[PDB]
């Protein structure tokens, strides 16, 4: 059955470009981060204007929660990660040590370790309950566009502008594998499949590839969208059908079929590049955020 994405609520109130959105591990709240230095909370079905968080001096590129949906880690253009008490917005800790912008950040399933990628051209393993930096991995020869943790937490997947997707052993820090396409276009986003066997990865020649990363082969490649300059965060969809969703640089959000690479559904409406999208853990909900010419979030619900 093909989806029926229906625009439900639109969220405005961001001073500048908004760069990252996420649903709660519970899915009652939508957390957004903006180049406006702000992190904001909204009603994850109704889109209600919740609290708004503050303390980062520069812009924020991305925002992740922990397993219990109790702390966010924002990654800011002020070289800083900060852990926030969602309940109050009182910044729990300010992780420090990167040399340049920090663009990607995430936790592990046990909501204790931080993974950050940065323009300092490194990745870093942090300790959430103390904020100390455990590991500096000279990850790539360039700025690091995404960092993700698998359903257990013994592997780090990293993206880089150098076309190098990469997989890391957390408990040791060793470089387990090293993906390369035969060509070397940059990779702007990466994450694990919810089942852990596979890896979504976006590249800037309008490409979005699914990978089985231990056999080292590309098992499918979805295209049609526009991705040449910006690092759009793409997602899977295993709630109803098994889909692939990703914003784009013609201010649309494209959806393909996970297992047949075909352009199942399209969602227009934004005014600028759609930079972020997430999908609710439980429900069939799509979030989407765009840059300064839009500065808004928008919600889509599908029956499947």
């Amino acid at each position: 059955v093909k989806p029926n994405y229906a625009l439900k609520f639109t969220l405005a109130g961001h001073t500048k470009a908004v760069s990252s959105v996420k649903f709660s591990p519970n899915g009652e709240w939508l957390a957004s981060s903006s180049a406006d230095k702000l992190i904001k909370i909204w009603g994850a079905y109704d889109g209600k204007f919740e609290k708004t968080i503050s303390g980062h001096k520069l812009g924020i590129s991305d925002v992740a929660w922990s397993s219990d949906s109790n702390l966010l880690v924002s990654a800011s253009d002020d070289k800083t990660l900060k852990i926030w008490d969602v309940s109050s917005g009182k910044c729990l800790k300010t992780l420090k040590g990167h040399s340049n912008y920090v663009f990607c950040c995430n936790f592990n399933p046990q909501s204790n370790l931080i993974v950050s990628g940065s323009f300092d051209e490194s990745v870093r393993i942090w300790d959430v309950k103390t904020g100390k930096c455990l590991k500096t991995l000279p990850a790539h020869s360039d700025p690091v566009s995404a960092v993700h943790f698998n359903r257990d937490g013994s592997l780090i997947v990293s993206s880089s502008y150098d076309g190098l997707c990469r997989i890391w052993d957390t408990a040791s820090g060793q470089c387990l594998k090293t993906l390369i396409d035969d060509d070397n276009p940059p990779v702007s986003f990466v994450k694990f499949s919810p089942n852990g066997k596979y890896i979504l990865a976006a590249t800037l020649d309008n490409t979005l590839k699914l990978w089985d990363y231990s056999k080292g082969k590309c098992l499918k490649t979805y295209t049609g969208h526009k991705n040449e300059k910006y690092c759009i965060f793409a997602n899977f969809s295993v709630t109803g059908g098994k889909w692939i969703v990703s914003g784009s640089e013609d201010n649309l959000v494209y959806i393909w079929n996970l297992q047949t690479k075909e352009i199942v559904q399209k969602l227009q409406g934004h005014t600028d590049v759609v930079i972020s999208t997430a999908c609710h853990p439980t429900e069939n909900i799509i979030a989407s955020a765009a840059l300064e010419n839009d500065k808004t979030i928008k919600l889509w619900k599908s029956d499947c």
Binding site: Q174, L176, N195, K197, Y213, S214, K215, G216, L219
Partner: protein, 307 residues
Amino acid sequence: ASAFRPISVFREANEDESGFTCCAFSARERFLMLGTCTGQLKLYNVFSGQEEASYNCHNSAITHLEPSRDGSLLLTSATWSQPLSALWGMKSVFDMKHSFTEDHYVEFSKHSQDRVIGTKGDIAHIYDIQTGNKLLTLFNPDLANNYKRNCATFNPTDDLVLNDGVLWDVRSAQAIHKFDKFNMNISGVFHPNGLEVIINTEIWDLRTFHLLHTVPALDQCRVVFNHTGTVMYGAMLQADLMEERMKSPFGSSFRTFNATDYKPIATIDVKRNIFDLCTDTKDCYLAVIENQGSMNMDTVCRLYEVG
């Protein structure tokens, strides 16, 4: 090989959800090696069912075992993780000897077990057990058949290799025949008698390259012989859709074939999904891993006596 008497069963010890995922009779008499869904390699008394040893080998489910004939070495492959395939020493103490970090399937040479042959996608890598040197790298893009489930294999005399449906002369490392691609996944094995090649449902002649036999029921099966290569066993695979729920590689039944004329013998349905099956060194036993189901896997080794 049409009658199959239950002889013993056992499940994984101390584990509410038994995770045996492959088996192979060790060179030691009354003992089977089972890899488990969680990287481990267990040692079991095939008759009592008692667990004798346990070795963390990989950090993902073990897919393939192959004990060496002389008892001293073991190969393991995994699903994901470094290394993908590992070679373990076994003489009185279990330690790693080598590791093939990119081969997703590994197997000993046949005649003298003086070389491991490993598969990476469409590529074959022969290694050397004492040193671990990659002696050869067999692949030819102009001839590749891109078998989804390719496994490069040695012939009985180690003279030839087969890999992606291409026949290789090992002495000259020159491909000497491509066999036409008639299926998406199965790459073929060499018949134990060394005179013929079984690629999915095609049985080709090794000397003339003639079609000798069509065997439709071997479509999509892995194949295993009894020690004497007089009985053939075929378990059919299942299937790519959806995310993961620990899906059994084979369906619920297997088949036995006269290894000489490919005429069928029996169909054996155990009414449970099969993960692996193997035959012993003395031609008495077939041992099969069988999922019982849970809320997601719960397997038991059943040891059958062949009749």
